[PDB]
Ligand binder design. Structure first.
Ligand SMILES: NC[C@H]1O[C@H](O[C@H]2[C@H](O)[C@@H](O[C@H]3O[C@H](CO)[C@@H](O)[C@H](N)[C@H]3O)[C@H](N)C[C@@H]2N)[C@H](O)[C@@H](O)[C@@H]1O
Ligand SMILES: Nc1nc2c(ncn2[C@@H]2O[C@H](COP(=O)(O)OP(=O)(O)O)[C@@H](O)[C@H]2O)c(=O)[nH]1
Ligand SMILES: [Cl-]
Ligand SMILES: [Cl-]
Ligand SMILES: [Mg+2]
Ligand SMILES: [Mg+2]
Length: 297
């Protein structure tokens, strides 16, 4: 508390702090709300610092290209050399969350699907070279999944029933051996496009999506990756609606491709629990892998 407030007030003489409250946190950042108005967002690691340095350069170039609100860093602070933090006016609205889309009526879901399709479209139109110049990495997704499959063999396979191992090997091979999945034209992607990052004003019937946050995973990569959490967290029906508005073709094949990404996400989630040495997380991740197999076959 006093730790974050002292850094803020030392570095920003125009901020007089009357209230401070925790707002949210993810794997890479801790966010607090100052005076009900300002989000101060603090990286949790050097990797978080790298991602924030990317966002500092990228987001100002994106503001004028998207039709939702995104964070605009007004305050740029430093913890010490190479350790930035930022402050931005809260992106307004209600975070939708996972449990949000499940309850929404048809007209609202239709409008949200249209707005998300448009947002993805805008990212796919953004000049890749400008993004790279802003520190956005070029992530060859085929090579990333190859490295993942090696890690799984080493760290994950020992924990599994051989039948679940057989399933995972099948999923990795189904992705890796099909050019229909592995070849793509790279684009700027958000990289973590899950509904915990969707800000809404459901009072607006026709334009319920108002904001998107957390661009820390932004990459030049496969645009189909930005469907992964739509499928995992919003469901196949909604995901297919977004795909239709975007003019995707052969949705059965595309859904299969994204479902492979979902499998790999479940592996990744377990690997994070193994890295953290969290037995509850490990057990949860093993269960999610079993559910992935049961849901697909
Ligand atoms: N909370 C419970 C859920 O947690 C995971 O899903 C969440 C991901 O963890 C998030 O992403 C983060 O973790 C990823 C690796 O897993 C990273 O690549 C990414 N950069 C991180 O921001 C993503 N934004 C939302 C998604 N619902 C499990 O998969 C899911 O089964 C489980 O129900
Ligand atoms: N309502 C609201 N919540 C925010 C805002 N910025 C961050 N948050 C919350 O803080 C959490 C952590 O921020 P995020 O950038 O996603 O951190 P990361 O996932 O660790 O990279 C988010 O998931 C939100 O819950 C904002 O502008 N408005
Ligand atoms: Cl992956
Ligand atoms: Cl398969
Ligand atoms: Mg986040
Ligand atoms: Mg992030």
């Amino acid at each position: 508390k006093l730790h974050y407030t002292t850094m803020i007030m030392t570095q920003f003489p125009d901020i007089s702090i009357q209230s401070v409250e925790s707002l949210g946190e993810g794997f890479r950042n801790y966010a607090i709300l100052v005076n009900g108005d300002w989000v101060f967002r603090f990286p949790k690691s050097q990797q978080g610092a790298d991602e924030l340095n990317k966002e500092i350069q990228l987001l100002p170039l994106l503001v004028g290209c998207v039709k939702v609100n995104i964070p605009q860093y007004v305050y740029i602070g430093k913890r010490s050399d190479g350790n930035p933090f930022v402050g931005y006016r809260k992106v307004q609205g209600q975070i939708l969350g996972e449990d949000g889309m499940a309850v929404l009526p048809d007209d609202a879901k239709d409008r949200l699907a249209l707005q998300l399709a448009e947002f993805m479209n805008e990212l796919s139109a953004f000049p890749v070279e400008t993004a790279i110049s802003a520190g956005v990495p070029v992530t060859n997704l085929k090579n990333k999944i190859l490295l993942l499959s090696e890690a799984v063999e080493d760290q994950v396979f020992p924990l599994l029933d051989e039948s679940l191992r057989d399933y995972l090997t099948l999923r990795f091979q189904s992705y890796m051996t099909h050019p229909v999945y592995t070849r793509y034209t790279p684009r700027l992607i958000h990289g973590d496009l899950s509904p915990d990052h969707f800000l809404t004003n459901l009072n607006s019937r026709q334009t319920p999506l108002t904001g998107i946050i957390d661009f820390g995973d932004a990459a030049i990569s496969d645009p189909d990756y930005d469907y992964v959490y739509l499928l995992e967290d919003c469901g196949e029906l909604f995901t297919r609606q977004v795909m239709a508005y975007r003019g995707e073709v052969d949705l059965d094949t595309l859904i299969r491709k994204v479902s492979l990404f979902v499998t790999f996400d479940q592996v990744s989630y377990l690997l994070e629990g193994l890295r953290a040495r969290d037995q509850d997380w490990i057990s949860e991740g093993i269960e999610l892998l079993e559910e992935d197999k049961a849901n697909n076959f």
